[PDB]
Amino acid sequence: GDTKEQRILRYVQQNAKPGDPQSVLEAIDTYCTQKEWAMNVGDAKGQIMDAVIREYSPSLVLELGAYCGYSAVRMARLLQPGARLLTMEMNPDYAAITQQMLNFAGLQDKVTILNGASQDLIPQLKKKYDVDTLDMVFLDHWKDRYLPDTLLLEKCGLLRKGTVLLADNVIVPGTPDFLAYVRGSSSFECTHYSSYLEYMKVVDGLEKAIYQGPSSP
Numbered sequence: 315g316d317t318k319e320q321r322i323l324r325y326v327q328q329n330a331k332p333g334d335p336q337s338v339l340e341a342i343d344t345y346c347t348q349k350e351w352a353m354n355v356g357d358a359k360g361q362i363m364d365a366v367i368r369e370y371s372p373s374l375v376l377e378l379g380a381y382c383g384y385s386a387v388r389m390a391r392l393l394q395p396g397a398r399l400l401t402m403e404m405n406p407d408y409a410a411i412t413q414q415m416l417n418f419a420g421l422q423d424k425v426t427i428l429n430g431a432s433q434d435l436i437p438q439l440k441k442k443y444d445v446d447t448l449d450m451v452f453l454d455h456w457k458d459r460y461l462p463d464t465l466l467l468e469k470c471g472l473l474r475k476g477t478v479l480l481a482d483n484v485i486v487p488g489t490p491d492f493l494a495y496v497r498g499s500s501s502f503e504c505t506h507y508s509s510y511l512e513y514m515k516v517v518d519g520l521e522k523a524i525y526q527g528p529s530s531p
């Protein structure tokens with residue numbers, strides 16, 4: 315049988331326009347919304363992602379976690395000339411779908427997909443992928459990995475003063491440890507975004523946590 319992620323890709327391949335990221339995004343959103351797997355992702359998640367990317371204009375973005383590639387396409391289409399996205403995902407099936415989604419959208423030249431465990435790959439980023447510090451980190455899909463990945467990024471010296479972390483699907487009482495960490499820490503300045511669409515209950519919540527370094531301003 316076919317996986318949900320493979321079915322999302324097949325729908326894009328059959329219905330979207332190659333080389334048109336907006337078309338790809340709309341197709342994913344339309345299909346997942348119809349199936350009731352995810353409701354109006356463009357409005358609830360994508361608009362917030364776009365606003366953050368446009369505010370900080372990051373040259374180097376690291377995405378931790380991927381499923382069908384929606385988030386990677388969303389970010390990559392807004393990267394400035396010369397900017398790049400590194401996307402790390404442990405599940406080889408999800409990584410493969412994400413690559414194919416970026417290919418279809420025509421964005422593969424701006425993105426490098428790294429299939430492996432974050433604990434193994436994060437310490438190799440500086441030497442293997444020419445990374446000094448990251449401008450933005452997008453934490454996606456796997457809520458329980460947000461905190462240990464953040465701590466490992468710090469240990470590896472990959473965050474600088476002003477590095478923006480944006481974490482998806484942070485909705486109280488979920489991600490209690492990650493929120494407790496960034497909110498409680500004097501090294502992170504935090505903003506929470508809650509998208510309601512037209513409804514009374516949160517559809518998606520995201521946390522922006524800006525690293526300040528270890529010292530006084």
Ligand SMILES: [K+]
Binds near residue numbers: 496497499504
């Ligand atoms: K804080």
